Amino acid sequence: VDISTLPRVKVDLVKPPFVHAHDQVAKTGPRVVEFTMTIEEKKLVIDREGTEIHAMTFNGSVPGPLMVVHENDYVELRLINPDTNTLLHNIDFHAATGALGGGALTQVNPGEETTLRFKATKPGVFVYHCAPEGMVPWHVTSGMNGAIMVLPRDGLKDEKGQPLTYDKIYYVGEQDFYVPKDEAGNYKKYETPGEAYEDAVKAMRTLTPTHIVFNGAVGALTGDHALTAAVGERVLVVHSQANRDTRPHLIGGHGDYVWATGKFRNPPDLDQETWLIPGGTAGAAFYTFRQPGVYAYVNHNLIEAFELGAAGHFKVTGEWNDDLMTSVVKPASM
Amino acid sequence: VDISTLPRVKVDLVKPPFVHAHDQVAKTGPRVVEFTMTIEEKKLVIDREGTEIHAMTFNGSVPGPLMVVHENDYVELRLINPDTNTLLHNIDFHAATGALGGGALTQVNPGEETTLRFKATKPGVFVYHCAPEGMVPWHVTSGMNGAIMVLPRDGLKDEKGQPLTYDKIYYVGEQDFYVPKDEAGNYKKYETPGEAYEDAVKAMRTLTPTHIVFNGAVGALTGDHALTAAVGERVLVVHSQANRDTRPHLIGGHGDYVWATGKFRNPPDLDQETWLIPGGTAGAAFYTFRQPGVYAYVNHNLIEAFELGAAGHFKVTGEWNDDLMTSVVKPASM
Amino acid sequence: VDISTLPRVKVDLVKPPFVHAHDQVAKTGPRVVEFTMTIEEKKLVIDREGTEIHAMTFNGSVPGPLMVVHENDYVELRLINPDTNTLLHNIDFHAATGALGGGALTQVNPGEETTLRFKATKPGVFVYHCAPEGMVPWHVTSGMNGAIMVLPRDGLKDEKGQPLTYDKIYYVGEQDFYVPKDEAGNYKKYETPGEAYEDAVKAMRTLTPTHIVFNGAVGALTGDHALTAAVGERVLVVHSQANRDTRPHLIGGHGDYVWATGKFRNPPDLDQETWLIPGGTAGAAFYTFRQPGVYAYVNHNLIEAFELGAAGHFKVTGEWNDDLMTSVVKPASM
Numbered sequence A, B, C: 001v002d003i004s005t006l007p008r009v010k011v012d013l014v015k016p017p018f019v020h021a022h023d024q025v026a027k028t029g030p031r032v033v034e035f036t037m038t039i040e041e042k043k044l045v046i047d048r049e050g051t052e053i054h055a056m057t058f059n060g061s062v063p064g065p066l067m068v069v070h071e072n073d074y075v076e077l078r079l080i081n082p083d084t085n086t087l088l089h090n091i092d093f094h095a096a097t098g099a100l101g102g103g104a105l106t107q108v109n110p111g112e113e114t115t116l117r118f119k120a121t122k123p124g125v126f127v128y129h130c131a132p133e134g135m136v137p138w139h140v141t142s143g144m145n146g147a148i149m150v151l152p153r154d155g156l157k158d159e160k161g162q163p164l165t166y167d168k169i170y171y172v173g174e175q176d177f178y179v180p181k182d183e184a185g186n187y188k189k190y191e192t193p194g195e196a197y198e199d200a201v202k203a204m205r206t207l208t209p210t211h212i213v214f215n216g217a218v219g220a221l222t223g224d225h226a227l228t229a230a231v232g233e234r235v236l237v238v239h240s241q242a243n244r245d246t247r248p249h250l251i252g253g254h255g256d257y258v259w260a261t262g263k264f265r266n267p268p269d270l271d272q273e274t275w276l277i278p279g280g281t282a283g284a285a286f287y288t289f290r291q292p293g294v295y296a297y298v299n300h301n302l303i304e305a306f307e308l309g310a311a312g313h314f315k316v317t318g319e320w321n322d323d324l325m326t327s328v329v330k331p332a333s334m
């Protein structure tokens, strides 16, 4: 086909955990979907202690924004590396075929930009990440990763082939950071990216993250930024981890339908308590809320969740169902 | 429904790896199933070296006992925290919906008790664990976790929808412990739970267990406490890990039918050598023994199994089948 | 049956990542397939730094060679431990039933040999490894593991039951090594296997590999030993990890059909980006190449891949498809 004959649509991305507007069932034929991302290297405070790192981001956030297209759309990404940055960057889409997912074609020095197009031939949620030759894990584990969702053109389906339609979608990007520690166990600090590199590699080689966070920081998806829903709403949570395994769990709920490894031609796993998203993968879980109140959404290595940062909240509005759960005798001495 | 119109049945739990009496196919309509558990904080020796920890238990054991109900039964748990204990505790059922799985409704100080009811709306094996706000992984990794099995009312089914019936069931709870170590690598000891807490958190944050055990101690499922079977028997092994991934394997056998993430509405995986149970999950594997002798049942990170403790035995009685395996030439010099 | 009435076929194995000649669909009835392996303890350089370890091998390689049979063939292995070796060895086949997978029947001192026969009753790819009582992880993590493929007699099938036929097959064995480190972080060296043992156990107990490699060394599957394919070829990659989880990923491609836990009676997972092979398992992924150029095949813990060694290359020949991917605007300043 002459791709120039296809419709074009532009999307300005939104900051995670929110997701740009889209339609589950495709309302048009195949399109070229145009996205622009601007790389930003920036300081970020990642914990309650005030630990500040030099993050490497797509569009200013950790994770980068969720892109949404349909199967056999074309993705056309304009990637900009402003001259205010220091490092070389590129992008690898796990959704794409060829050229190291695009990384071989998108190397941009500060002051440069590029435009890549690929055909989204497989439905699913997929990781994207920076991957400069020779320095790949340093960029990924500095926050330079996100995800793309390639919906089937007829939307999602259950294990029987019947439609599943979400009312709300959220994108939780989970980030392992490796802040270098000294003999005493104290975090070390660095003056330039080049002076940081060897100790960054040493810290990564421990295979022991210092922080594991959702949306870029301890507690980011809590408080005024808790996720929200109403009783009876159907919610899809897309979860990615570009480098390390995770095991999501909704405390007080389930994954009613889960694509743990994220690929929608497969039937979902039903009624999951907890599911394994391998490092380098995006997964998706669908749940219909049945009770109001606070939920915690966690990586169910509970050390990772409650000590290292991999925990967020939902605040759910609505009616309490005493058939489903009740306190028969409240805590008391007798 | 008026739950007061339903039958009630009481169960006194039994110590793992054994499981209280039940029927696979439900012989009654939906019931309220009454369980009582008494929390016991106690010293436990966890290894052959004599390392003694302060364990936190449901009903005196690590893991806590397996509860068995059927889909859409109600579980009514009386949870008792005697005044001989020191700490606050509660319970979160991954089988339940709402209130952090029950944890928000079951906080009991020493000297208190509570009764929780929930409807078991999803079939599967599920983790339960203590989860006091702000101290969750410390309680879980001190042994305060178990599992509940919610059987379909028509029992288990294979990948084709035909019945699978077990002759024996065992519950293997796998526990990661994090005994604090000093600079020399030596275990540290503590006088009160409060004096222990910070170094417990530091040890957990290494993400490196010091011990990984079945049924509470190195070698617990060996010797006079090896698991047993006969050739031709169908055995279900329920395996849980509340905090960390495991990968069970029957050395000399297989998982003929495996629900690795434990949820029975899904078809089982067939003929598994090894399967991944994510931390925060229970799984179940069904096997028909075909050869007698000693088997080892392990976490197949063999360091975890044979150095850190995650290994038990089966002793199987019966006929040897030389068609299936034989020594053609016994080890010899020639 | 009288096994003596069956055909016998002898196979001389080939060095990974190549695989001995075989037929996907069985061209004969059930056979006794005869294999011989000679154990070799040898020094191996495992990294670009020149780090040299004392490896324990089947047939001189890490991993050991891939054996290929069909379901309900018999495998007859002659295992030789020459008197030039120092240690006791044996073999455990995860494909086999009974006697700890054969390990109880195959213990050979230096100067001894043995012949084991077993029936390959379950289709799939499976790990085999040495497992001497009391020293199991030391042998496995010194390289003494490989895999066996038990093909269905009618070859591989997709999720719909239609045939899948590979044009090329490769075997990637992934090895975690634990070279002991001193206080300074420097590798330690040892004069005899007995003098090495305690520090080998200590290093293993860190659960932190020093090296994670394909085909026995950093960079082994690169350069003149890169894997190869042509555009349009169907390639099966069998991947094993006898001790530790891995998460394979083809950078620039996918797993079109993946048996992540390796057992062919199950339907494959479709369109995977990344898949989890649990430690103690072999998996298999099928892909049809669609673009030429260099691909990296990695464990997608990118630290494990690019810092610790778990990365190889494909070099793919053929036509570039600009519909699938193109550079619209090459990197430039504007």
Ligand SMILES: O=N[O-]
Pocket: A062, A063, A064, A143, A144, A145, A146, A172, A173, A174, A175, A213, A214, A215, A216
């Ligand atoms: O970029 N990770 O959430």
Ligand SMILES: O=N[O-]
Pocket: A106, A107, A108, A109, A112, C331, C332
């Ligand atoms: O800017 N280099 O492709």
Ligand SMILES: O=N[O-]
Pocket: A249, A250, A251, A252, B092, B093, B094, B100, B101, B131
């Ligand atoms: O039940 N979640 O910890």
Ligand SMILES: O=N[O-]
Pocket: A047, A210, A211, A212, A218, A307, A308, A309
């Ligand atoms: O140190 N982790 O939030």
Ligand SMILES: O=N[O-]
Pocket: A230, A231, A232, A317, A318, A319
């Ligand atoms: O939305 N329930 O009141």
Ligand SMILES: O=N[O-]
Pocket: A327, A328, A329, A330
């Ligand atoms: O909950 N009233 O005892």
Ligand SMILES: O=N[O-]
Pocket: B062, B063, B064, B143, B144, B145, B146, B172, B173, B174, B175, B213, B214, B215, B216
């Ligand atoms: O409590 N864990 O076996």
Ligand SMILES: O=N[O-]
Pocket: A331, A332, B106, B107, B108, B109, B112
């Ligand atoms: O004892 N407090 O719910």
Ligand SMILES: O=N[O-]
Pocket: B249, B250, B251, B252, C092, C093, C094, C100, C101, C131
């Ligand atoms: O074959 N189990 O180590």
Ligand SMILES: O=N[O-]
Pocket: B047, B210, B211, B212, B218, B307, B308, B309
């Ligand atoms: O030190 N583990 O049994």
Ligand SMILES: O=N[O-]
Pocket: B230, B231, B232, B317, B318, B319
């Ligand atoms: O139970 N077999 O003799």
Ligand SMILES: O=N[O-]
Pocket: B327, B328, B329, B330
């Ligand atoms: O096993 N007899 O040589």
Ligand SMILES: O=N[O-]
Pocket: C062, C063, C064, C143, C144, C145, C146, C172, C173, C174, C175, C213, C214, C215, C216
């Ligand atoms: O032996 N492992 O590649």
Ligand SMILES: O=N[O-]
Pocket: B331, B332, C106, C107, C108, C109, C112
């Ligand atoms: O050489 N011992 O079986």
Ligand SMILES: O=N[O-]
Pocket: A092, A093, A094, A100, A101, A131, C249, C250, C251, C252
């Ligand atoms: O996209 N692989 O790093």
Ligand SMILES: O=N[O-]
Pocket: C047, C210, C211, C212, C218, C307, C308, C309
């Ligand atoms: O130190 N690893 O190649």
